[PDB]
Amino acid sequence: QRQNVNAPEVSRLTRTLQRFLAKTVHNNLAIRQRRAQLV
Amino acid sequence: RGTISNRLKTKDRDPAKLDASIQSPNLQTVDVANLPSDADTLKVRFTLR
Amino acid sequence: LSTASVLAFERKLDPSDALMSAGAWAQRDASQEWPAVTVREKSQTVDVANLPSDADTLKVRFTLRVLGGAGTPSACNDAAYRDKLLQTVATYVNDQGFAELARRYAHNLANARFLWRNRVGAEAVEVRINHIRQGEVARAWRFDALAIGLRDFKADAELDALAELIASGLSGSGHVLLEVVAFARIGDGQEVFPSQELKTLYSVRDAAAIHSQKIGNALRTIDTWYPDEDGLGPIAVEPYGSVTSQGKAYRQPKQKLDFYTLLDNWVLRDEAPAVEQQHYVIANLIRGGVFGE
Amino acid sequence: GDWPAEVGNRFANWLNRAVSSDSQILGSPEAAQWSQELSKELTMFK
RNA sequence: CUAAGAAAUUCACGGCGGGCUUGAUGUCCGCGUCUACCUGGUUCACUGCCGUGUAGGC
């Protein structure tokens, strides 16, 4: 901090969405429920 | 217990599951109102001021 | 130019819940005081609906309204698509009216296919259809349901008369309500098969019954124009014509014979064959549904 | 009305290029689905 | 090969006392939510000439 001059859960959601649509278990309603949940 | 009878949101290639598969049913619960089997006319009653 | 975002077709051939009642054969004439079969429970635990031990005959009964004006949708979003759909169904009935579809509906009411599981082990089935004009019987039929096949469509005088009456109701020239009552010889104390709920059988007022949508599914099995090998027979007219109990889906959209591709070719760019797929798409909109974007 | 459909489109393009597993292509209809999802939730403000 | 190299702060305390926030108010008007669906691919069941004797019976 100066008056003169000076100077990640979204990534967790994206990573678990990618790791979720990587694998498939019987491709049922709960998969689309979790996809709608993550989006 | 119906069938999937609607427009499909995408083509045969679907990575992230949007639409249901056609070779699969769908379960719903609906509200229905019928007359009794011995009563064959409906009476609708309301007031109008 | 395009299809509407919302499109809703209301149900034609409106059935009721088929009330079931036991009785004896050769007493079908005075079959008004017949006691309705009820659901009992037994040993986790399940439900079961049999007949009384002094009754060898099941009798189901349901009232079927037919509406007419099947090509008029109840909901749209643009007037041009409704005008084009009305023009296509109008030129359909102006090329040929409801003569094949009404004959196949009269067949599916003639052979008791609304007896879903109770038909397949029945010694003799008789269907009685009474056209209720005001409150009384105007025209009464008496159909041998087993002599008329399930996969072949015969020709008969009384069946073509019923086809003409259902055709007159489907075109809009008359109000048609039919009391349909089916007597099936199953046996003393045999088991009936009502529609199962979400094992709990469905009942209304201490009386086991079949659902209205199961009866509406059974008299709708008229689809014989689809690229299957010969041996399946008639299926019910669903869009993407499915048998979910068999896990198969005939007219899947990679083949160009589903309801939606035939509709958007037969309406938006005027493309369907002569007799077969036009009858399929007209029977599918007779069933009704939700279509759109 | 210029912003919501375009924001949903470019958000779904970001989610397309960000989420692409061994099922490699994600595609344009999924992009339109997530685009209209965010577009409804952005026009819900007024 | 470091303005290098080193460094014991250490002890204690009485913040006390008192208090009127007051009054008053007109949310007020409309509404079409529709549409179609097979819970079925399952109830490993009462017995008994039975063998309780893991095969044996309608």
DSSP conformation letters of chain C: ----SEEEEPPSSB---EEEEEE-TT--TT-SSPPBP--EEE---EEE-B--TT--EEEEEEEEEE---TT--SB-S-HHHHHHHHHHHHHHHHHS-TTHHHHHHHHHHHTT-SSSSSSTT-S-EEEEEEEESSSSEEEEEEEETTTS-SSS----HHHHHHHHHHHHHHHTSS-EEEEEEEEEE--TT-B--PPB----B-BSSS-BEE-HHHHHHHTTEEE--SSSPTTS--EE--SS-EETTTTEESS-TTSS-SHHHHHHHHTTS----SSHHHHHHHHHHHH-EEEE-
* Contact status, residue C241 vs residue C260, Cβ threshold 8 Å: no
Neighbours of D16 (CB within 10 A): 16
Residue B4 CA to residue C3 CA, distance in Å, equals 20
Residue C20 CA to residue C180 CA, distance in Å, equals 12
Give the residue among A11, C151, C107, A18 at the shortest CA–CA distance from D22.
Answer: A18
Reported as type and span, the H/E element at residue D29 is helix D28-43
D22 reaches B (C-beta below 8 A): no
Residue C147 CA to residue B35 CA, distance in Å, equals 34
A contact chains, 3+ CB pairs < 8 A: B, D
Q: SS3 of A36, please?
A: helix
Q: SS3 of B18, please?
A: coil
Neighbours of B13 (CB within 10 A): 10
Place of tokens 């007022």: C205
- Measured between its terminal Cα atoms, the distance across chain A in Å is 36
Q: SS3 of D21, please?
A: coil
Indicate yes or no: strand E within 7 A of the C-beta of C82. Answer: no
Q: Which of C242, C243, C256 is best to mutate for the B interface (most B CBs within 10 A)?
A: C242
- How many angstroms from the chain centroid is the CA of residue C135? 24
Query: What backbone torsions phi and psi does residue C182 show, to the nearest 5 degrees?
Result: -115, 125
* Contact status, residue C178 vs residue C106, Cβ threshold 8 Å: no
User: CA separation (Å) from C100 to B40, C127, C195, D20?
Assistant: 31, 21, 30, 51
- How many angstroms from the chain centroid is the CA of residue D10? 6
Write the CB contacts of C175 (distance below 8 Å, at least 6 apart in sequence): C169
Residue C179 CA to residue C63 CA, distance in Å, equals 5
Residue C66 CA to residue A15 CA, distance in Å, equals 55
Place of tokens 């005001």: C134
Residue B36 CA to residue C36 CA, distance in Å, equals 14
C261 CA to E34 C1' in angstroms comes to 25
In this complex, the nucleotide whose C1' atom is nearest to the CA atom of residue C13 is: E36
User: For the residues of C183-215, what is the DSSP string, one character each?
Assistant: EEE--TT-B--PPB----B-BSSS-BEE-HHHH
Q: SS3 of A17, please?
A: helix
Tell me the one-letter amino acid at C172: G
Place of tokens 């069933």: C287
How many Å lie between the alpha carbon of B26 and the closest alpha carbon of chain A?
Answer: 10
A15 reaches B (C-beta below 8 A): no
Place of tokens 């019928």: B34
DSSP B2: E
Residue C45 CA to residue C292 CA, distance in Å, equals 44
- How many angstroms from the chain centroid is the CA of residue D29? 10
Strand partners, C9: C289
Beta carbons of A18 and D21 less than 8 Å apart: yes
Rg of chain C on CA atoms, in Å: 20
D46 CA to E25 C1' in angstroms comes to 32
Residue C45 CA to residue C59 CA, distance in Å, equals 27
Q: SS3 of A13, please?
A: helix
- How many angstroms from the chain centroid is the CA of residue C46? 29
Give the residue among D1, B21, C262, B31 at the shortest CA–CA distance from A27.
Answer: B21
DSSP B32: -
Neighbours of D33 (CB within 10 A): 18
Resolution of the structure in the document, Å: 3.4
What residues in B contact C239, CB-CB < 8 Å?
A: 5-6
Relative orientation angle of helices A29-38 and A9-22, to the nearest 10 degrees: 160
User: CA separation (Å) from B33 to B42, C17, C112, C212?
Assistant: 11, 11, 26, 12
Q: SS3 of B25, please?
A: strand
- Paired tokens of C85: 């759909």
- Paired tokens of C173: 């020239």
Residue B41 CA to residue B35 CA, distance in Å, equals 8
C243 CA to E38 C1' in angstroms comes to 10
Long-range contacts, stretch C31-34, CB < 8 angstroms, 24+ apart:
C31/C59, C31/C181, C31/C183, C34/C59
Q: SS3 of B26, please?
A: strand
Neighbours of C235 (CB within 10 A): 20
DSSP B23: S
Residue C53 CA to residue C48 CA, distance in Å, equals 15
Deposited experimental method: cryo-EM
Residue C105 CA to residue C159 CA, distance in Å, equals 10
> What are the b/e assignments for C203-230, b being 16+ CB within 10 Å?
beeebbbbbbbbbbbbbbbbbbbbeeee
Give the residue among C288, A4, A19, C194 at the shortest CA–CA distance from B6.
Answer: C288
CA dihedral C223, C224, C226, C231 (to 10 degrees): 130
- Paired tokens of C290: 């939700």
Give the residue among C184, C187, C182, C180 at the shortest CA–CA distance from C50.
Answer: C187
Beta carbons of B15 and A31 less than 8 Å apart: no
Q: SS3 of A24, please?
A: coil
Place of tokens 């109840």: C74
Give the residue among C61, C187, C184 at the shortest CA–CA distance from C111.
Answer: C184
Q: Which of D16, D33, D34, D37 is best to mutate for the B interface (most B CBs within 10 A)?
A: D33
Give the residue among D27, C179, C202 at the shortest CA–CA distance from A21.
Answer: D27
* Contact status, residue C103 vs residue C156, Cβ threshold 8 Å: no
Residue C130 CA to residue C139 CA, distance in Å, equals 6
- How many angstroms from the chain centroid is the CA of residue C5? 28
Q: In this structure, is the dihedral angle defined by the CA atoms of residues B37, B38, B40 and B44, taken in order, positive or negative?
A: negative
Count Cα neighbours of B48 within 13 Å in the Cβ-side half-sphere.
3
Residue C14 CA to residue C212 CA, distance in Å, equals 8
